[PDB]
């Protein structure tokens, strides 16, 4: 095949790079246009910058291979945030002209460092919501595209739980009207290894009042069946007077060949058998720390090895008499006595404990929102929400309109909230400017590389940019060409929502954006906008 | 694949509009052309707008995307009703050149909201007829071809019925004239499970005088066949003595591992069978509340889960002897005691009552036409006719004809009444201009949004486009070159009957359209629209 | 697919109408062109009009669409009648032009009307031919391409048989010279509703030697099957002693919910199985209507059946009302034949079809020639029918073959002769219709006023005038009657004495006098056919392909 090399690589790159930004940008503001995609025989027509991301194709493998690494880093791999995609690619696209404007590897090394400072600003300036705080709600108006009714309940449902965050799932109901299920019950991430050993053996949901649970950490596979054998017989034989059926195996995966063992050892004992229940349940989770939150709620003990079954006591064997509901997608807990709540809650404290002591750039990181994760489940209510309408396709629109606020309010809750409608970056960029220069230590050496050069006016103009496209063809830049900022602007911010027609400030009229989608979208577009300007050769081999 | 960015993706879809618009148009009046579309190996030549819609097909990929935006929402997604297709390609095509013709975001939202008013005036302006009234002879004879024997009788078959909504079948007769089969009888939406449960065991037409039926709620399967002979046997053991052969066990589905079940329990118990007639039918129907309708002609007790059967009593089970006839397609009830009917009539006003308490927009929607859908299913009486003629081919032709008067006159009771000739859209669009022009306390923004931009008179002369396809090359259009509206003839409109040749009014002549069919083209009509003319980018891939 | 809209359909519709009229007009008169066809690996040389309709093909799709339009009405769905096909198309090429020279719908509203009113002459100018009247001679020798043999013995088999209307049935035999075989046998419409129900199971030709016929009037179906049960059972219990095996089931039409209810009445009594033959046969007839009840009355006859008005009635029977005949009867899918008819039977007939023939006698001279009396006569012929097999022989194989379908036209004409009527040759009936309505409307001074407003003022009558002339004129071009000027113009006296040319002898008379005579029927529906394309062809603006 073909090898590209030279001026002609940077003349691909350049293409891509703005045909894709045209396509995305034209999304945003309120003239913001219709993206109308086809997929098989029929017709898709959508405004959301990621699906159109997601879909764009080009003809040529070189303009194809560029444009795997402009969308698909924060399209495939962006599974867990949806949000931000839009804003990524606007970034790449600003920052690659700001790294070929000044090229050489000594300007490359000053531009990565304001910038990481800039990022530096944006973490601190997140404002940390509470729970019972109003400010929720103009967060849910703005995710819900203008809904007065959800916003609404949505709301309602976080600041009525004072106390205790709301896990909430979505089914597509029946009716017109929605229909709401709280319950007081844990959710975990534990599920069937195989269909035979719930109720009915075919995979139902058996509710229990009573169990033995025991937490292994390895992968159960063929080799494991003989220790299997060794470890369940030593249980039901020595330690069988302080044992509640059924006695739970929760581990990493139970392959087939385990499986089918377990299965005949359950045969072997047809005396413990009570209303066709099964005494015996291999249970799988899809992070090792994951199976520790699931050995504190149980009271099992944890287990490195499968043939550390035989060596047990009365002290390591615990038989709780709660109630759980075990199922195919995940297991349910619902009874949970006073003594149990205790060690839960003490257990929680100490992943509390570990996140105090981070540094205030790790609290971002995926280190920390993994442990939050983890709190989350030891102490959360679930909510079943039965979406309805009036057809079909109305009913699971407003299924995943609910899940755009649930997803806007869970992230704003946990990371945080900044002033939408561009305001935010261009503070952030006039503020890393201000303090520099004015700090007088380091005066000297921030005006040679920044200043002089010319770098820090040029990444003044770079912020605009969402502010400029979200508030074009407006009452804003009405009095001249173009709308410029000066230093009054910063104290109080100037946009206009589109919904009702006014001027004011974002923190006055109620426009918000979650901190982590924000900054994520300027760390992820840097290195983006970098690899694509140091590029010089394409291998199509 | 290729992607379309810009002023190319407007052009295709001024085109593609343009084409569509020229082939279905050319149908209406009375110079209406014709239309020759090809169907394997045979031609079929047609004036029917909606055949026309549904076929129009294109070579290029980015000319058949956009086909499916215009055509298909109103051809393959609109089954309930046929008629309103022509009218809403035609209204699409108008209201995108008002879009195009003021552009910006600002211009649009004034649209939208003046074209909302009228719609909410063609919704006041609908004649709901009522059953006695005899405008229903005036649809009937424009329907039937001028028809003076047909329509007097179909009118008195719903005007005679003042209480009740007839069901009308037909049938190819055997003499000259036409023989009448008037029934006080119900059709109910139940029919067999499986073939064998009927008499002869091969799906034939059992018929009954005495049952016991029970409704369930659940789709029953593999997993409910424990629960069914745990609830077949309590009945036929326990509560024998109350209990009226056969037991009607009604629900959503039947699947063949319950239905075999079934089979294995009615060879269970011998002594109960009589004459051939298995004593225990499973019921399925193709919308819960539907069954609760189900639940109340039969006396029957709505029951949620299987297991629901062991748990019964006197109190609840209730056998009726009244007189039924199962079928493999539908069930139909015939004799119906008083006691009966007062709980049938007394449920009919609930529904009633409900609709009584609901907002105007919300009389026109699904809700509102699904729950009138109930109340004439719980009020109905079947009607067959045999129609009879002079040869084989004037009886299938008068077949045609009657089956025509009917789907007018149904449609009629049921949708609205609206004066035809392009007239009702005329006099909304001129009613709303005069309502807000003279309505002094917002005539300063009335003016400011509509009057002054032009947008008002330009959506005057829209409303005219119906009127001139209809009544260009004739006798209204013949003093000057274009005839032209006024104040005067709000009051009383001008069209001209194109089967006798006169001049007069659509209340005088009689030329009238169902109102559901006119309200629900201009809304599907302003939303596709919009979207072709807001949107910029094609994606082929 | 591609759409084509506006100019351009009008366009190709026109051309596809030139190429199928050039085609097929060609075959007609005294230069009559012929037509070489390719099929497989052979060769077809022809000049029949149909043929060449059937075989004509288009590459585009657009040409191929429209020229199914024109052919296939008078091509596939006309099966019945071969005749008028030429005559179809040449109308409809015709009546096009109208349209187009006299645009929109206020003049096509007028034409529509005008020429229904020429429909109705036609209808009224039919002679009705008698069966001893000589005329069918000349009618046989016409459609025999000039045989002086055949004609003579097919128009003698009709004249000789007077009284009785002969069904002939054709087969390729084996010697030089023709055989006829006579038979005393009646044709009936009843047919099997299933295949099951015949002999082998699988819808073959059942001969019988004894049967007990029950007629029934209504249409069956699942409505039905309790009482077939019922009905069944009575008699094979009850009245099993007087009951000659099978039990046919005559009714209007049996619904496969109804046959296969009697499928399993067959096997719930196998005792009464023999060889195969299934005792129960239900049987269909292909009528509808009141006019349709009365040949049902005429099959009960025949069989003496009783009628039977629903199918709960096969209860309630006696000896007096079964009567299980022992005749000889061969049933078929496509028709049942009836053959050993005994006396005491043919008296039964024959009282019946003078009750139907003392209905005729005591009607008016305009109702004799309505559909009443004429269906009448149909039932007549039916009651009173003979079966004729005619072998027909050859020098070769293909001369058979090609001499069996001259055998069949013949028959086809005379049948049709004597049933719908007969109307002078030579494109002059249409002219005779045309300058009769006209001069009709005209000289009647009550609609004078408006039927000068609507033809005569505008030129639509004048211009329908022209049209009349284009038969006569295919006909007699290249000939001693378009010899003294350029072309020969009708007038007032050519419509009481019309001229013609025999082409055969050479000579100028009537068509009266020479012997030159058309089925009505045909010439009727191809005005009515050539109308209704015609206006098609001309309202169409648009073709989808897709």
């Given at each position: 095949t073909l090898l590209v090399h030279g001026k002609d690589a940077q003349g691909i790159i350049k293409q891509v790079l703005s045909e894709v930004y045209d396509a995305v940008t034209s999304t945003m503001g309120p003239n913001g246009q219709l993206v109308m995609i086809k997929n098989g025989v029929s017709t898709k027509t959508t405004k959301d910058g990621v699906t159109v991301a997601r879909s764009i194709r080009f003809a040529d493998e070189a303009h194809e291979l560029v444009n795997r690494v402009i969308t698909e880093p924060a399209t495939?791999?962006?599974?867990?945030?949806?949000?931000?995609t839009t804003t990524t690619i606007m970034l790449t696209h600003a920052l690659y002209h700001l790294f070929k404007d000044f090229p050489g590897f000594q300007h490359h090394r000053n531009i990565e460092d304001l910038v990481e400072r800039v990022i530096q600003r944006l973490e601190s300036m997140a404002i940390r919501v509470e729970?019972?705080?109003?400010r929720l709600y103009q967060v849910a108006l703005t995710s819900s595209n203008q809904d007065e009714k959800l916003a609404r309940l949505v709301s309602e449902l976080y600041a009525n739980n004072k106390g205790s965050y709301p896990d909430i799932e979505l089914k597509e109901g029946v009716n017109f009207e929605d229909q709401i299920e709280q319950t007081t019950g844990r959710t975990i991430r534990m599920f069937y290894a195989?269909?035979?050993?719930?109720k009915g053996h075919q995979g139902g949901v058996t509710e229990l009042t009573g169990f033995t649970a025991f937490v292994i950490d390895r992968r159960i596979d063929k080799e494991d069946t003989q220790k299997l054998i060794d470890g369940v017989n030593h249980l039901v034989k020595?330690?069988?007077?302080?044992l509640a059926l059924p006695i739970l195996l929760i581990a990493r995966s139970f392959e087939e060949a385990a499986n089918s063992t377990l299965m005949q050892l359950n045969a072997a004992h047809p005396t413990l058998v009570e209303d066709g229940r099964p005494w015996l349940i291999p249970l799988s989770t899809p992070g090792t720390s994951e199976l520790q939150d699931i050995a504190v709620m149980l009271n099992a003990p944890m287990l490195s090895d499968v043939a550390d079954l035989t060596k047990l006591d009365t002290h390591s064997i615990n038989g709780q008499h709660g109630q759980l509901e075990l199922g195919g997608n995940r297991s349910i807990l619902k009874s949970t006595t006073p003594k149990d709540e205790d060690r839960i809650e003490q257990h929680a404290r100490g992943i509390e404990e570990l996140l105090e002591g981070f540094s205030l750039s790790d609290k971002f990181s995926v280190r920390a929102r993994y442990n939050e994760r983890r709190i989350r489940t030891l102490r959360g209510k679930l909510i079943t929400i039965s979406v309805g309408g009036e057809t079909y396709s109305e009913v699971k629109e407003r299924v995943d309109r609910y899940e755009d606020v649930v997803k806007a309010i869970r992230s704003a809750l946990e990371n945080g909230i900044l002033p939408g409608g561009g305001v935010s970056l261009v503070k952030a960029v006039f503020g890393t400017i201000k303090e520099g220069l004015e700090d007088k230590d380091q005066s000297a050496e921030f005006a040679k590389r920044y200043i002089n050069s010319g770098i820090a006016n040029e990444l003044m103009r770079l912020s605009t940019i969402q502010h400029k496209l979200l508030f074009k063809?407006?009452?804003?830049?009405?009095?001249?060409?173009s709308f410029h900022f000066n230093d009054d602007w910063l104290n109080t911010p100037t946009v206009m929502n589109l919904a009702t027609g006014e001027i004011g400030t974002p923190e006055g009229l109620g426009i918000y954006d979650t901190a982590y989608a924000s900054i994520t979208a300027l760390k992820g577009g840097l290195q983006t906008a970098k690899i694509l300007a140091t590029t010089k050769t394409l291998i199509l081999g």
């Open positions: 495939k791999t962006d599974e867990e945030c949806g949000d931000g729970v019972d705080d109003p195989n269909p035979w050993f719930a020595t330690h069988k007077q302080h063809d407006t009452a804003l830049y009405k009095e001249n060409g």
